Amino acid sequence: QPMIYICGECHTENEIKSRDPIRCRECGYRIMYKKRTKRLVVFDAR
Template structure:
């Protein structure tokens, strides 16, 4: 069985604001100040679907389901 390498995920320390990268199994703790509350950074791209609904004769119909790409600025 081939296991793909796991990419580290970026987190921001809730106390000092330092960026930390963690892999599965790492201790959840800031490497700079030791604070144990870290917030996950937003990913660069995220895909979300929002349904478009229309009211027709007292009924709600699905017009389309669209896909949007969100990018952090």
């Protein structure tokens, strides 16, 4: 299963598997965020 993440400075979609050194291509920044979910979320305007 392709797990995708986002770099802290490049903001590029990088695919890495489990037990890998957290890194991003064309850079060396070590902050990797997770993309927002695709599931439907219901919010109340109250």
